[PDB]
A paper describes a structure:
Equine hemoglobin was the first protein structure to be solved at high resolution, and is a model system for the study of structural and functional aspects of radiation-sensitive metallo-proteins. Serial femtosecond crystallography (SFX) at X-ray free-electron lasers seeks to extend the sensitivity and applicability of X-ray diffraction to structural biology. The method greatly increases the exposure of a crystal beyond conventional limits, and without the need for cryogenic cooling, by using femtosecond-duration X-ray pulses that terminate before the onset of radiation damage. Gas dynamic virtual nozzles (GDVNs), which focus the liquid stream with gas to diameters much smaller than that of the nozzle orifice, have proven to be a robust SFX sample delivery method.
Through extensive prototype testing, we identified a DFFN geometry with 75-µm sample line and 70-µm gas orifice diameters to exhibit optimal performance properties (Design 8). The low jet speeds of a few meters per second are well matched to the measurement frame rates typical for low-repetition XFEL sources and state of the art synchrotron sources. Crystals were prefiltered before loading into reservoirs and injected with no filters in the line from the reservoir to the nozzle. Diffraction extended to the edge of the detector and thus probably extends to higher resolution. A twofold non-crystallographic symmetry was observed in the crystal packing, with the whole biological tetramer (A2B2) present in the asymmetric unit. Electron density around the radiation-sensitive heme co-ordination complex was not indicative of X-ray induced damage. This confirms that the low-speed jet injection approach with our 3D-printed DFFN can reduce sample consumption rates when determining X-ray structure void of conventional X-ray damage at low-repetition XFELs.
Numbering used by the authors:
A (entry chain C), D (entry chain A): 1 to 141
B (entry chain D), C (entry chain B): 1 to 145
Write the structure that this text describes.
């Protein structure tokens, strides 16, 4: 599914993210909640207001999980197993919402990394986020 | 497909600064690179085999401008999207047989290009407003199915 | 959302043969089994943990019948679907927040259940007609989005 | 995507399909063409009328490819590589069309194997068809 070129594109792109993975995760969440309000249904216990500390905290965990995935491109099912259990079994997140967050993530990267967000990197990050979504929405136990 | 008065004003103010040629060319080019199956409808444009050839293809830049100009007509007739895209809907549904899912894809790509061009000025609330616009365009373009 | 004179007659002849009890329950049950994330909207129905509990759930069978009765309204009001499903569309968008993609899924599962019950009597052309009906109902139900 | 239970169901279900794989592929194709005329774009040289020798022949190749996949569930990218190149790089088939054929192929199995098309087998063949679709629509070579 992911070619070797995609893996190296994702690897290099995420090296540009560097220590900002949490900030970008948080901003992506903020863009998703405002742009697709249905997604707020999955966080009824969150303070979703402007500057919310909960969103910032959750974004850090989303960013950290993606960094982990970037380091296990060759075995995402095994590396993300615990996260698949939470999202597919416990939380039963509609797969549609993963397309929305992926789009909001790419938007965030486009804002902060305009010179590095080339079409090819764009295309490889899209494949990457799609493969991560498939793992997190699947019951493969 | 309705926005508030403040939303409309913000959407229109940003479109005043949109270069329809540069944004259109980049948006169509990214569609062909990121969703390669869309290339099938543009075989008469020539070599689309790699992003370099796609992003520098003059026919891609020209058509992208046309496409973005049509988004502009939608941005200026938010209350009449169906009638504004009626003819284009017949073209894409009854004559080209383009699956409506690709309309949504091109609208999200456009948003990503807008985010890349305007940076921090493309705020989350401003993006939220344009997500409504692109969805409205996408549904209007698929109304003939 | 238009059928020929023979299409609508053929669609109705098959609907007369539909068991209003089994088909609704089986289609909804298959939806919860094959697309498990849909179970999230039915936490109040009880045990949905395995296909046996879902397919034998009395609340699933009851609700399935309701769903099939609403599909019936679509088969008998093709020329006014948008108005027939106005209230249900509002229910699923404002209150339940069901993504329109799931309407398509339930619509295809229903088709698969009809195929299972009627076998070779569910011809390709007869299915083609029901794909039109199922798409129309799904589109009417998502109009409030 | 595919669990151990899914593999077992798929293999067992496909043993009931047996030698009807070609018939079912052809009927599935015919249901797709009538039910989704958009798919007719990819066969401009075919007679799509009922009983076509081209459709029946083409259906045989789809049935055979699926039978091949069933014996290589653990390495679909490797076994279906040549067909992935054909569909993604050469033919550039819109991924939406794989969901339409998958639905039409499940419709066909429901017609001919109604007693074996249980909810559990239904759920596993759908996962199976999605994994095959993902391989055939991905440019990973
Ligand atoms: C690439 C996609 C995603 C990644 C990498 C991801 C990552 C994570 C992580 C790391 C956690 C751990 C939370 C914790 O330990 O406190 C989590 C939980 C959670 N996820 Fe996601 N997630 C993704 C997509 C989504 C989407 C699309 C939704 C819904 C629209 C969602 C809803 C949730 C919720 C509700 C929780 C629990 C939050 C809490 O109870 O504090 N996730 N996710
Ligand atoms: C989503 C928003 C879209 C808009 C607003 C749009 C708009 C347009 C416009 C303005 C034209 C020019 C018609 C003319 O010059 O007479 C056109 C033609 C065309 N469109 Fe699009 N389009 C969209 C999406 C797509 C997509 C997703 C595809 C295919 C994947 C597509 C394929 C085509 C083709 C093949 C043509 C004819 C090209 C030619 O003149 O040779 N369009 N569209
Ligand atoms: C063509 C597709 C559908 C039709 C025709 C349909 C029809 C209906 C009907 C008739 C009701 C009863 C409303 C009432 O009694 O006032 C209902 C309620 C409901 N629908 Fe559906 N529906 C469809 C799709 C879906 C889907 C795909 C989901 C979730 C995945 C869903 C979730 C619900 C829920 C949770 C309720 C409320 C259940 C309850 O409170 O007992 N619907 N729908
Ligand atoms: C499970 C899904 C599918 C399978 C297993 C499959 C399998 C195959 C096979 C085995 C071939 C011939 C390979 C060869 O001769 O080397 C083929 C060719 C082809 N496929 Fe598919 N396919 C699938 C889906 C689709 C879809 C969804 C479309 C379009 C809507 C499509 C369009 C075509 C076309 C146009 C050809 C070439 C026809 C020709 O050469 O005359 N396929 N496919
Ligand atoms: Cl590039
Ligand atoms: Na994109
Ligand atoms: Na189906």
């Amino acid at each position: 599914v992911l070619s070797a070129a995609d893996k190296t594109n994702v690897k290099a792109a995420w090296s540009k993210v560097g220590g900002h993975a949490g900030e970008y995760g948080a901003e992506a969440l903020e863009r998703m909640f405002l742009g697709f309000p249905t997604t707020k249904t999955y966080f009824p216990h969150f303070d979703l207001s402007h500057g919310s500390a909960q969103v910032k905290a959750h974004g850090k965990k989303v960013g950290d999980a993606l960094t982990l995935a970037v380091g296990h491109l060759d075995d995402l099912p095994g590396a993300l197993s615990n996260l698949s259990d939470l999202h597919a079994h416990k939380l039963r997140v509609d797969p549609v919402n993963f397309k929305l967050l992926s789009h909001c993530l790419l938007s965030t990267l486009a804002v902060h990394l305009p010179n590095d967000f080339t079409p090819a990197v764009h295309a490889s990050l899209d494949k990457f986020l799609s493969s991560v979504s498939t793992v997190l929405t699947s019951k493969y136990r | 497909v309705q926005l508030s008065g403040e939303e409309k004003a913000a959407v229109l103010a940003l479109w005043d600064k949109v270069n329809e040629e540069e944004v259109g060319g980049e948006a169509l080019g990214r569609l062909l690179v990121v969703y390669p199956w869309t290339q099938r409808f543009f075989d008469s444009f020539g070599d689309l085999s790699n992003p370099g050839a796609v992003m520098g293809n003059p026919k891609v830049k020209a058509h992208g401008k046309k496409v973005l100009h049509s988004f502009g007509e939608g941005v200026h007739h938010l209350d009449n999207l169906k009638g504004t895209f009626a003819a284009l809907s017949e073209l894409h549904c009854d004559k080209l047989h383009v699956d409506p899912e690709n309309f949504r894809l091109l609208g999200n790509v456009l948003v990503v290009v807008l985010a890349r061009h305007f940076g921090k000025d493309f705020t989350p609330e401003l993006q939220a407003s344009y997500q409504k616009v692109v969805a409205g365009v996408a549904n209007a373009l698929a109304h003939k199915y």
